[PDB]
Structure 1
């Protein structure tokens, strides 16, 4: 088949050669090297035979350290004397423009005060501090370990708790795998290395200065003081050698339980303040600058021969913090090999039914900026014509098994395709990727199916799925959750994401990366070439039944309050029942369509394409204009995680502590009502008459 030709043409050695060629130098967004990398990708796409390959630019707010006013954290004594001040990989000694560690979009400032340790700065950590531990973070500098949640959530939470600065650090508990040596001898994080990353709270907005509209040359810009999501306190990241020094002499209360203690040889006492030391106060000194900077997406096409006005997007970012050999450049290499394989099909006369859009996004590391600005520019055509969005970010975050996150529409296609892709895993040499994935990560809701996760955020599908309602999916290799307890991977967002790390420690044969390229490309192929779009709406019906049971179950502890305030889930369960009936009826009619009647086929394909769109509410979610999907949103507590029925979940979260119970329960009733309507409206789009 053509699909088999596409998959079998892809080669591990080509992905290896692309990855080596793209990881010799840093390629930070907005810098010359990342523009050169865009031009290299564009030249390659033209060689591969794509119909178009254009640079599309925007001028967006980015953030960089000031080369002549370096950031640092210090400890001073009571005489204001500085007692302590916080401070390339082998083969890269001559690389001169590695950006020093910082947290992009930090406020500027030089706050000084007592230090308080806040664990992971999660919502439950700050609840514990205020409600159980007697700690008031107002006016304090807080120190938080990285991990568990998106770092911009930590900064939001610290600001809500009243902190005047937050120091982020990498605890070995979270970034040092047991019995692995630090880079370069192994793949662990050395104590000298800090994790970069932005600390915005954009909630889907894109460029901070231009929410809603693409950041073109003429575009209106908010004043920078009003840029969306920009934090109002300084934030800076340090490695664990420096953090150990800051934590060692903290006094005050002991850590409240083992879940607050990391792995350093310190007490993990909370503060505020020091004991047993010259150590008196902590200062931060953070002077990153925010500047409007040009970014460049590469956007290419293969136009459809039958339905050129229908799109499948394969998009992945290419900007990195340093070399980014895993994040994103492993995905950049996969995307080039997928485009090369589609080019080889074209060289033998093939053309897809629908149009493929290839996209290499810029400034993802600064808040999904290039992908979101392109969505904002092209929203009218994208929302009326897009079948699906397949991401192409990091392909290799671990070497254990596959991880897939996608809308329920795509479950059956994912399972189908993984059965036809050879497994790359040791011991599975005559078996499919589906077989090894099922053995290694079975779904909690059905032991005979591999686990597929909900979509959250933190990569470039966000605007497509959560704002525009375009069915989306992502797939990559990952670690074993049962045995590997570190967050992300040890060297994430550090200088040590090198080609050598990937080849020596993650995937020497490049077979695991190859299997990811084959699955991402095969997904695009099936979506773009199949006469009937390969979605299954009965899987969505089943997913809604699960989510409705889950939110109802979370309500049970409030049963008396539901009764007293006249709150019922009946309308939500009724809408889900109606949706299930409509989805069953729709599939019964779909198998009857006359495949030789192009309008009959197009009408049913439009119902398949527009079903995800029905869940999009233009009014958005409370306080979040750009999260419009009523079934899924990024968790308010952790942008990386997806939350189901987010309007209901957020209304009932911590409800027992709301000042006004009558008002709080009416908010729960509002979001139940909106979810019921939205599901019923979605069901209505499937109806025959």
Structure 2
């Protein structure tokens, strides 16, 4: 038989291991020749594997690189202007790679150039609340200071935005052992911890879903009109650079001014974690100087796009997509994901060679430049937006398959919950102590749902990966799944470091490649069901259940201000009414879905299921974020990695007691309630009888 079991059984841990090794021997930085060569290799193999067509789709997008002959670094400078301490020019390369060329040194992609000199202020994680605590409670002024922040908790682009708005003249990002060194585990290469010389690379843009900073709305094709740099989307206005904890300790140890306000501000280094500004008495005349000479340049990038044409509904697309570009070797990020995609393609191709095709078309993508702002997936979706609009069933992401070895981690639309519960019940758990048990059992035991007793936890989709354009801009049902640790937004210790290698994975994360195999079964299984099930495997009732939970939650936030709700007549009745109607109508649609040989009614009904995620899109977008159009979900305005529910109302209520004109502020809360109630009702009505 050619069924899901046939598909699943053909996947091999040994193949994923071979592919990972193959993808991680040299760096594959976006816009470099080596990453163009890997793209051509993948294109060739996907053809070999049996796909109907495999093309490269290229774009010319803004990237950012250090200057090879003028290196980035930070100094402590004395009053004579002598640089008495300098941060490292590169990470000590790992054993056996000390002669690899073209390892990009640590840098913050898209930093402007500058050489600012000033006094340090330590801002903890540089979160919105950390800056509130500094300015409002401690009365510390960041204007014209160099801010030093530890990595972790939120997307680093939000840190930089926050520092900029606090008036900082530069930002130093560092990895604190508190966040990147697990107690009792050894540093790379003897364990999976971050050494003192390790540094996390990463872009610091605030693109809000725009894609290439120069071409928002349109693909960066060969005739594209580009904004000038001054009008580019999402570039930081102050220099930024990351460092490791050996260098950070040297910068923090001399810090004076005010004590940290509490223990949540102290990391694990042997320093007081004084907030500053500036150094204690003896060193009060010393300053910190940054030297940043990185350049932004328009650079060609290449996506590989593989097609397996559907036998029955070739105009319905199930997409499996993940990126290929890496900061250095990409041992976990992304090649642990890409190796799984490669094996999934191989298995689907094996079935195809025996005469099978999926019912719907499957598209497979190897995205470029994800590390520089989701650029490859976003440009391709801008180019193909009308096709995706009208034909996109689902998008399944495929970055890193592992970030730990503890249990499954799934983020997806409520429309895919039942598909995921059902599939994981049919898969074997790879976990020690659960041999003979289902993945559903071990996942549910290790990651219990807090909201829904007895179920495993499934999180909201945020952003910070390639599903963003498909889900938040276009409204195509999306999901992702990976193995994870027991710090959820911080990354694993070696994240975006030179030390993230094949050996890291083979020695410390997944020696038998059983977690990679489990994740290939989950991702590949989801794609298989989505592409082959006669009725799309979406349960609208799961959306009704979460909508009620999110409505309760947003109402509860507003109800912290009962006087204002009274004064301005702020009612959530419309939103609860719309959610009630969505519940009722979804329940009736489910009955019809059970109760209909008629392919028009079937496809009519499958169209209603497909367009249900689409119904949550508002073509006007969210306030000042035109590329975030989903009304139920958006990346949090304070942390791109986290999803926020009813984001328009949430941002309207955020810090509302601080707004100078409460009448206007509460008016805008009421506007967002109306938009949310309307969109929920309109989405519900897509499920009503069509005539």
Q: Give the TM-score taking structure 2 as reference length.
A: 0.98
Q: What is residue 453 of structure 1 aligned with on the other side?
A: 459
* Aligned-pair CA distance for 1:539: 0.4
Q: What is residue 269 of structure 1 aligned with on the other side?
A: 274
Q: Secondary structure at the match of 1:611?
A: helix
**Structure 2 Cα separation of the partners of residues 505 and 335 of structure 1:** 22
What whole-Å deviation, never above 9, does each CA across 1:470-495 have from its counterpart, x for those lacking one?
A: 000000000017xxx89310000000
Q: What is residue 215 of structure 1 aligned with on the other side?
A: 220
Q: How does 1:647-662 map to 2 (within 5 A)?
A: 647-662=648-663
Do structure 1's residue 168 and structure 2's residue 173 form an aligned pair?
yes
**Structure 1 Cα separation of the partners of residues 36 and 77 of structure 2:** 43
**Structure 1 Cα separation of the partners of residues 433 and 55 of structure 2:** 43
What whole-Å deviation, never above 9, does each CA across 1:140-196 have from its counterpart, x for those lacking one?
A: 000000000000000000000000000000000000000011001111000011110
**Structure 2 Cα separation of the partners of residues 479 and 351 of structure 1:** 37
Q: Secondary structure at the match of 1:449?
A: coil
* Aligned-pair CA distance for 1:276: 4.6
Do structure 1's residue 398 and structure 2's residue 394 form an aligned pair?
no
Q: Secondary structure at the match of 2:76?
A: strand
Do structure 1's residue 11 and structure 2's residue 12 form an aligned pair?
yes
Match of 1:235 among 240, 245, 256: 240
Q: How does 1:12-31 map to 2 (within 5 A)?
A: 12-31=13-32
Q: What is residue 369 of structure 1 aligned with on the other side?
A: 375
Assess if the C-alpha contact under 8 Å between 2:256 and 2:275 holds in 1. Answer: yes
Unaligned runs of 5+ in 1: none
Q: How does 1:392-471 map to 2 (within 5 A)?
A: 392-471=398-477
Q: Secondary structure at the match of 2:490?
A: coil
Match of 1:126 among 119, 127, 131: 131
**Structure 2 Cα separation of the partners of residues 33 and 405 of structure 1:** 32
Q: What is residue 195 of structure 1 aligned with on the other side?
A: 200
Do structure 1's residue 338 and structure 2's residue 339 form an aligned pair?
no
* Aligned-pair CA distance for 1:425: 0.7
Q: What is residue 303 of structure 2 aligned with on the other side?
A: 297
Q: Secondary structure at the match of 2:75?
A: strand
Do structure 1's residue 308 and structure 2's residue 311 form an aligned pair?
no
Q: What is residue 74 of structure 2 aligned with on the other side?
A: 73
Q: Secondary structure at the match of 1:74?
A: strand
* Aligned-pair CA distance for 1:93: 1.8
Q: Secondary structure at the match of 1:53?
A: strand
Do structure 1's residue 247 and structure 2's residue 252 form an aligned pair?
yes
Q: Secondary structure at the match of 2:561?
A: helix
Q: What is residue 673 of structure 1 aligned with on the other side?
A: 674
Q: Secondary structure at the match of 1:442?
A: coil
* Aligned-pair CA distance for 1:85: 1.0
Q: What is residue 627 of structure 1 aligned with on the other side?
A: 628
Do structure 1's residue 348 and structure 2's residue 349 form an aligned pair?
no
**Structure 2 Cα separation of the partners of residues 147 and 33 of structure 1:** 30
Q: Secondary structure at the match of 2:210?
A: coil
Assess if the C-alpha contact under 8 Å between 1:173 and 1:486 holds in 2. Answer: no
**Structure 2 Cα separation of the partners of residues 619 and 563 of structure 1:** 30
What whole-Å deviation, never above 9, does each CA across 1:72-125 have from its counterpart, x for those lacking one?
A: 111111111111111121111220110000000011111111110000000000
Q: Secondary structure at the match of 1:469?
A: coil
* Aligned-pair CA distance for 1:415: 0.6
**Structure 2 Cα separation of the partners of residues 514 and 169 of structure 1:** 34
Unaligned runs of 5+ in 2: none
What whole-Å deviation, never above 9, does each CA across 1:226-278 have from its counterpart, x for those lacking one?
A: 11000000000000000000000110000110000000000000111111545
Do structure 1's residue 324 and structure 2's residue 330 form an aligned pair?
yes
Q: What is residue 107 of structure 1 aligned with on the other side?
A: 112
**Structure 2 Cα separation of the partners of residues 631 and 465 of structure 1:** 11
* Aligned-pair CA distance for 1:676: 0.3
Do structure 1's residue 642 and structure 2's residue 647 form an aligned pair?
no
Q: What is residue 392 of structure 2 aligned with on the other side?
A: 386
What whole-Å deviation, never above 9, does each CA across 1:184-222 have from its counterpart, x for those lacking one?
A: 111100001111000000000000000000000101100
Q: Secondary structure at the match of 1:571?
A: helix
**Structure 1 Cα separation of the partners of residues 640 and 405 of structure 2:** 25
Q: What is residue 580 of structure 1 aligned with on the other side?
A: 583
**Structure 2 Cα separation of the partners of residues 106 and 652 of structure 1:** 32
Q: Secondary structure at the match of 2:454?
A: strand
Q: How does 1:171-186 map to 2 (within 5 A)?
A: 171-186=176-191
Assess if the C-alpha contact under 8 Å between 2:408 and 2:481 holds in 1. Answer: yes
Assess if the C-alpha contact under 8 Å between 2:489 and 2:641 holds in 1. Answer: no
Deviates more, 1:74-83 or 1:672-681: 74-83
Assess if the C-alpha contact under 8 Å between 2:259 and 2:273 holds in 1. Answer: yes
Q: Secondary structure at the match of 2:603?
A: helix
**Structure 2 Cα separation of the partners of residues 214 and 559 of structure 1:** 47
Q: How does 1:546-625 map to 2 (within 5 A)?
A: 546-593=549-596, 596-625=597-626
**Structure 2 Cα separation of the partners of residues 256 and 587 of structure 1:** 54
**Structure 1 Cα separation of the partners of residues 453 and 336 of structure 2:** 31
Q: How does 1:506-517 map to 2 (within 5 A)?
A: 506-517=509-520
Do structure 1's residue 530 and structure 2's residue 533 form an aligned pair?
yes
Q: What is residue 664 of structure 1 aligned with on the other side?
A: 665
Q: Secondary structure at the match of 1:19?
A: helix
**Structure 1 Cα separation of the partners of residues 124 and 139 of structure 2:** 15
Assess if the C-alpha contact under 8 Å between 2:112 and 2:237 holds in 1. Answer: yes
Match of 1:153 among 149, 154, 158: 158
Assess if the C-alpha contact under 8 Å between 1:176 and 1:486 holds in 2. Answer: no
**Structure 2 Cα separation of the partners of residues 659 and 57 of structure 1:** 48
**Structure 1 Cα separation of the partners of residues 402 and 639 of structure 2:** 22
Assess if the C-alpha contact under 8 Å between 1:107 and 1:232 holds in 2. Answer: yes
Q: How does 1:19-98 map to 2 (within 5 A)?
A: 19-87=20-88, 88-98=93-103
Classify 1:535/1:467 alpha carbon distance in 2 versus 1 (closer, same or farther; 3 Å): same
Q: Secondary structure at the match of 2:528?
A: helix
Q: What CA RMSD, in Å, does the superposition of the two structures yield over aligned residues?
A: 0.9
Which stretches of structure 1, 4 residues or more, deviate above 6 A after TM superposition? none
**Structure 1 Cα separation of the partners of residues 389 and 360 of structure 2:** 15
Match of 1:282 among 288, 299, 320: 288
Deviates more, 1:329-338 or 1:341-350: 341-350
Assess if the C-alpha contact under 8 Å between 2:154 and 2:490 holds in 1. Answer: no
What whole-Å deviation, never above 9, does each CA across 1:343-362 have from its counterpart, x for those lacking one?
A: 11112111111100000000
Deviates more, 1:420-429 or 1:329-338: 420-429
Q: What is residue 500 of structure 1 aligned with on the other side?
A: 503
Q: Secondary structure at the match of 1:153?
A: helix
Match of 2:147 among 131, 142, 145: 142
Q: Secondary structure at the match of 1:522?
A: helix
Assess if the C-alpha contact under 8 Å between 2:318 and 2:527 holds in 1. Answer: yes
Q: Secondary structure at the match of 2:538?
A: coil
What whole-Å deviation, never above 9, does each CA across 1:36-79 have from its counterpart, x for those lacking one?
A: 11111111101110001100000000000001111111111111
Assess if the C-alpha contact under 8 Å between 1:174 and 1:486 holds in 2. Answer: no
**Structure 2 Cα separation of the partners of residues 91 and 81 of structure 1:** 36
Assess if the C-alpha contact under 8 Å between 2:408 and 2:484 holds in 1. Answer: yes
**Structure 1 Cα separation of the partners of residues 75 and 441 of structure 2:** 53
**Structure 2 Cα separation of the partners of residues 17 and 566 of structure 1:** 63
